[PDB]
């Protein structure tokens, strides 16, 4: 799924809960569940995965750091 998809995915889901802009750890959950269940051919759990994803801040991800996901979908 191209950059132009994933850009539209991230934004919509980042706005699931109170905040419009970041992906919370518990917000990534729903995202993954709906859109990536078969794509997660790994061992990594949510929290472990989030903790690759979020550079060093610790509360919520945003598209910036989500580009690690955009890489790892080829991984
Ligand atoms: Ca949010
Ligand atoms: Ca962050």
Curated annotation (Swiss-Prot):
The keyword Metal-binding applies. GO terms for molecular function: calcium ion binding; calcium-dependent protein binding; vitamin D binding. Ca(2+) 1 binds at residues 22, 27. Pfam families: EF-hand_1, S_100. Keywords: Acetylation, Calcium, Metal-binding, Phosphoprotein, Repeat, Vitamin D. The modification Phosphoserine is found at residue 38. InterPro entries: EF-hand-dom_pair, EF_Hand_1_Ca_BS, EF_hand_dom, S100/CaBP7/8-like_CS, S100_Ca-bd_sub. GO terms for cellular component: apical plasma membrane; basolateral plasma membrane; cytoplasm. Ca(2+) 2 binds at residues 54, 56, 58, 60, 65. PANTHER family: PROTEIN S100-G (PTHR11639:SF73), S100 CALCIUM-BINDING PROTEIN (PTHR11639). This is Protein S100-G. It comes from Bos taurus. The gene is S100G.
């Amino acid at each position: 799924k191209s950059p132009e998809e994933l850009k539209g995915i991230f934004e919509k889901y980042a706005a699931k809960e109170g905040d419009p802009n970041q992906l919370s750890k518990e917000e990534l959950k729903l995202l993954l569940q709906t859109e990536f269940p078969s794509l997660l051919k790994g061992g990594s759990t949510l929290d472990e995965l989030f903790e690759e994803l979020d550079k060093n801040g610790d509360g919520e991800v945003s598209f910036e750091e989500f580009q690690v996901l955009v890489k790892k979908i080829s991984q």
